[PDB]
Structure 1
Amino acid sequence: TDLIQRPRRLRKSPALRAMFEETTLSLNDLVLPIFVEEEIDDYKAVEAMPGVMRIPEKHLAREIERIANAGIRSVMTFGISHHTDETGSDAWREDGLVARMSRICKQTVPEMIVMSDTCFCEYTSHGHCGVLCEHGVDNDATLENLGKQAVVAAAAGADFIAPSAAMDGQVQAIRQALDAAGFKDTAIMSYSTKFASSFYGPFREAAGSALKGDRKSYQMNPMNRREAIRESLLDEAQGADCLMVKPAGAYLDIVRELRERTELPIGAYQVSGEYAMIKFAALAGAIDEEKVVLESLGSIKRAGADLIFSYFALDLAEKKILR
């Protein structure tokens, strides 16, 4: 044939595939979500998430030095509560689990970037992401409490307040409460586009949320691409330092669309259900885990994300697979 065009020319060797590799993933792209249970003495393995386990609070300090030492520069704290009420009030206690989780990390490793998952689904009796009613999760009652929380997390050392509630106006809510209290420099990692997703399967088992029902009156419809972009652009207008798409894996078209519609940094969360799907298929021997893990993360980065939340971060770090 007479093809002047031969794409295959640059795939002839490993050296050549390397010179022309358009995307590259490194360790500075990963944020390690960490699970921390108060009032427990020994490590609890999560079943649905092969290799992940709850860090007993009394060990938080040791592990976050371990995390820090393998090179992970950021963490997203999730707490498993033992003091859950109707409003989820522990979460905005001067020394609630939320605050302690932050304080212990920044104390133990000063330069470590601490993001605090700011919500109520793990601290509420009902397990919904906020204040519940004769109508459902009340949006504005939840914003007042998201603000109350933000300030104690900020106050306890988190570099980022990550509103995880999917409440309208949560970012603006949190910006003002943080400012008013003298926390003008504390940033917001907005879970801006957070879907009511079936990929969160393993997560209520991992961080013990006590909700039996669903979050579809606040977390958005997986199928709504226009609305997902709109969700994120509203948080930009409310001052978010960073936007986010969760889940990430089945929403890379969403991450790309958004990367072209804002100059802001974009995070993508590779959720428990994605980790679970990788882990359980490698066990059955169906796929090569390291291969599928690097390709998975790389696809996220290719779609446009600046930071990726992944539960594989530490192990990729330590086995020194990502430098």
Structure 2
Amino acid sequence: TDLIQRPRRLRKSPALRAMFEETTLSLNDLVLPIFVEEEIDDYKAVEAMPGVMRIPEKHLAREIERIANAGIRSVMTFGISHHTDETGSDAWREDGLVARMSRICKQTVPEMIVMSDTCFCEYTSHGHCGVLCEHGVDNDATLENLGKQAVVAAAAGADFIAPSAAMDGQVQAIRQALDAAGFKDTAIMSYSTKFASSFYGPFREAAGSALKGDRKSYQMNPMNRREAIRESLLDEAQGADCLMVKPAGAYLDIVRELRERTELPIGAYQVSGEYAMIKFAALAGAIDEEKVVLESLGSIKRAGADLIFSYFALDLAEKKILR
């Protein structure tokens, strides 16, 4: 045949493929989500997320040291509340679970970058991400509370306040609140593009969010690509230090489009449902877990993500699979 162009020439050997690989994945690209349950004794297994367990608050010092020894540079904290109410007020109490998870992490490992999930669905009796109303989740009532929670977590040592409530103006609210309390240097990792996904079931079981309905009046429609970009750019305008796309696995088109529309770092969340789909397919012997995990995380990097939130990070770190 007559072909000047033969893409296969650079695919002949492992060495050639290595030399021409366009995207790299390292441990530094990973942020590890940790679930911490207050007022409890033993680690609790999360059924829907094989390998994942609620860390007892009294064992957090031990765990964050373990995580840090594995090479993990960062964690995103999620608390399981034993003090849920109507407005999730435990979250903004100077000594509530939110403040303490941060405090225990920063005090045990000063160099650990601690990102504090910032919401109310794990602390409200109804399970919704804010103050409920005859209306639904009240946007501006919630903004006030997010700002209050932001200040106590910032005071507790959190490096990033990561608003995941999907409230309009959330970044501005929190930016205004941190600044006024003297936390002008505390960064905001905004879950800027957060879809009303059906992939969060395993996470709600693990973080114990008591929601019976859905989050469609605040988390955005999965189908809306132009809206997804607008969501994140409104947060860049508001001062966010880092932007994010969640879920990440089935939204790589969003990640890539966003990368082309901002100079800001972009995080991407490999959600619980993705973790779950890989784990159960591997358990059924249908796929090779490690190859599938590396290809998955690699694609997220390829699409333009600077940071990836992944429940596989520790195992990848300890088993020296990523360095």
Q: CA deviation at 1:204?
A: 1.2
Map Cα deviations across residues 194-240 of structure 1 (whole Å, 9 max, x no partner): 00001112111010000010000000000000000000000000000
Q: CA deviation at 1:286?
A: 0.5
Question: How large is the Cα RMSD of the aligned pairs?
Answer: 0.3
Q: Number of matched residues?
A: 323
Q: CA deviation at 1:34?
A: 0.3
Residue 313 (structure 1) aligned with residue 291 (structure 2): no
Q: Which residue number in structure 2 is paired with residue 2 of structure 1? A: 2
Aligned mates of 2:282, 2:111 — CA distance in 1:
35
Map Cα deviations across residues 280-312 of structure 1 (whole Å, 9 max, x no partner): 000111100000000000000000000000000
Aligned mates of 1:37, 1:125 — CA distance in 2:
16
Q: CA deviation at 1:35?
A: 0.4
The percent of aligned pairs where both chains have the same amino acid is: 100
Aligned mates of 1:154, 1:200 — CA distance in 2:
27
Q: CA deviation at 1:24?
A: 0.2
Map Cα deviations across residues 153-172 of structure 1 (whole Å, 9 max, x no partner): 00000000000100000000
Aligned mates of 1:119, 1:28 — CA distance in 2:
26
Map Cα deviations across residues 98-122 of structure 1 (whole Å, 9 max, x no partner): 0000000000000000000000000
Q: Which residue number in structure 1 is paired with residue 164 of structure 2? A: 164
Q: Which residue number in structure 2 is paired with residue 29 of structure 1? A: 29
Aligned mates of 2:309, 2:160 — CA distance in 1:
14
TM-score (norm 2): 1.00
Mapping of residues 39-78 of structure 1, within 5 Å: 39-78=39-78
Question: What runs of 5+ residues in structure 1 fail to find an aligned partner?
Answer: none
Aligned mates of 2:126, 2:271 — CA distance in 1:
22
TM-score (norm 1): 1.00
Q: CA deviation at 1:48?
A: 0.2
Residue 193 (structure 1) aligned with residue 193 (structure 2): yes
Map Cα deviations across residues 23-77 of structure 1 (whole Å, 9 max, x no partner): 0000000000000000001000000000000000000000000000000000000
Find the residue that maps to 1:202 and give its secondary structure. helix
Q: Which residue number in structure 1 is paired with residue 239 of structure 2? A: 239
Q: CA deviation at 1:263?
A: 0.1
Map Cα deviations across residues 238-266 of structure 1 (whole Å, 9 max, x no partner): 00000000000000000000000000000
Find the residue that maps to 1:300 and give its secondary structure. helix
Aligned mates of 1:50, 1:87 — CA distance in 2:
32
Question: What runs of 5+ residues in structure 2 fail to find an aligned partner?
Answer: none
Aligned mates of 2:273, 2:257 — CA distance in 1:
23
Aligned mates of 1:172, 1:31 — CA distance in 2:
24
Find the residue that maps to 1:64 and give its secondary structure. helix
Find the residue that maps to 2:84 and give its secondary structure. coil
Map Cα deviations across residues 126-158 of structure 1 (whole Å, 9 max, x no partner): 010000011100000000000000000000000
